[PDB]
């Protein structure tokens, strides 16, 4: 159980997540005793959601879901239609519409597609929510993937002195299904996981949503930078290190003379 849970963690840590559902099926058909909180630890992909009473696309996640009834922020309704419509602050619901609107604009600014959905609620002093951006590898390019931006906005909204607190949890899945002739059958990708906090004296001109877009974008940039740098160069490091295109019988003597230069440095120091 517990040791099996650790095995499943290392499993998922090393399993190819393009088979999350089939790998999860292997996990259930292998250990159904630990079928309790599978997706609590195991990271899930995103799910399409189209409203029908309104007719607008939204997303399917954890907090919008009520048992099996997902909340539609277009109609603020639980699907399958239930009278169990436990909905949060209506004012914040409209503010959420504005937030998701701005973020749909934002995804149309940096992504031009996909769906953004920050499903929030209303806790005691603060609350939390989830940032959801579903944008797979578009058919416009044979290079594909599955962009899933799942983030947790954790607003520890204080009261005295118009201040509040923020905490961002992050993860963005995406593949690199680049199978061009020059790329052969290149495929790479994954997701990261980071966090950050904030203690802002939140005014009215810069709301919580503004902070969200700001630091979230900043985080995304850090992620993108980390990917592009560390992981790409890392892979290339391993490539050129293992399979090199460098003829030896030269580097030894040249570095030997360089060491002689270091000797000369020591001759004066």
């Amino acid at each position: 159980s517990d040791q099996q849970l650790d095995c499943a963690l290392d499993l998922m840590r090393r399993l190819p997540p393009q088979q999350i559902e089939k790998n999860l099926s292997d996990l259930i058909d292998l250990v159904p005793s630990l079928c309790e909180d599978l997706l609590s630890s195991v990271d899930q992909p995103l799910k399409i959601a189209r409203d029908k009473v309104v007719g607008k696309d939204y997303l399917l996640c954890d907090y919008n879901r009520d048992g099996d009834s997902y909340r539609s922020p277009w109609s603020n309704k639980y699907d399958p239609p239930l009278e169990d419509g436990a909905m949060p602050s209506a004012r914040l619901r409209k503010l959420e519409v504005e937030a998701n609107n701005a973020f749909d604009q934002y995804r149309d600014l940096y992504f031009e597609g996909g769906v953004s959905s920050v499903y929030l609620w209303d806790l005691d002093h603060g609350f939390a929510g989830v940032i959801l951006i579903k944008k797979a590898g578009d058919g416009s390019k044979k290079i594909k993937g599955c962009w899933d931006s799942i983030h947790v906005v954790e607003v520890q909204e204080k009261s005295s002195g118009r201040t509040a607190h923020y905490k961002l949890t992050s993860t963005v899945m995406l593949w690199l299904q680049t199978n061009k002739s020059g790329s052969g059958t290149m495929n790479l990708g994954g997701s990261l996981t980071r966090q950050m906090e904030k203690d802002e004296t939140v005014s009215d001109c810069s709301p919580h949503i503004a902070n969200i877009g700001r630091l979230v974008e900043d985080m995304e940039n850090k992620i993108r930078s980390t990917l592009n740098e560390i992981y790409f160069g890392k892979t290339k490091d391993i490539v050129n290190g293992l399979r090199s295109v460098q003829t030896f019988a030269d580097k030894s003597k040249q570095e030997a003379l360089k060491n002689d230069l270091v000797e000369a440095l020591k001759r004066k120091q």
């Binding site: 436990a86 909905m87 949060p88 602050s89 209506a90 004012r91 209303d122 806790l123």
Partner: protein
């Protein structure tokens, strides 16, 4: 309130009527006539009879349309006066009743 389903609500129910203050003097009248009923049922087994009479007179017929303002304010002191007529009578009965009944001749005399 629960079917509204708006947000985290802070409504604290405040329930308090105005007939409570009137009920207070009425409860004093309850206990007054109650213990006075006990008094007229006790005074048989004799000056205490007339004492309870005059006390009940001077305290019941000064009710003043039983308004709780003067009820509490001054009729509470009038009830205290009634307690002193009654309290004194009870103490006297207890003191001499103890000394006499505790000095019975025999068991039959005790009966």
């Amino acid at each position: 309130v629960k079917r509204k389903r708006e947000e985290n609500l802070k409504m604290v129910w405040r329930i308090n009527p105005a007939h409570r203050k009137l009920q207070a003097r009425l409860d004093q009248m309850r206990k007054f006539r109650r213990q006075h009923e006990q008094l007229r049922a006790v005074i048989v087994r004799a000056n205490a009879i007339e004492e309870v009479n005059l006390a009940y007179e001077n305290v019941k017929e000064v009710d003043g349309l039983d308004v709780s303002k003067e009820g509490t304010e001054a009729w509470e002191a009038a009830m205290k006066r009634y307690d002193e007529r009654i309290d004194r009578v009870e103490t006297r009965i207890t003191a001499r009743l103890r000394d006499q009944l505790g000095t019975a001749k025999n068991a039959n005399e005790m009966f």
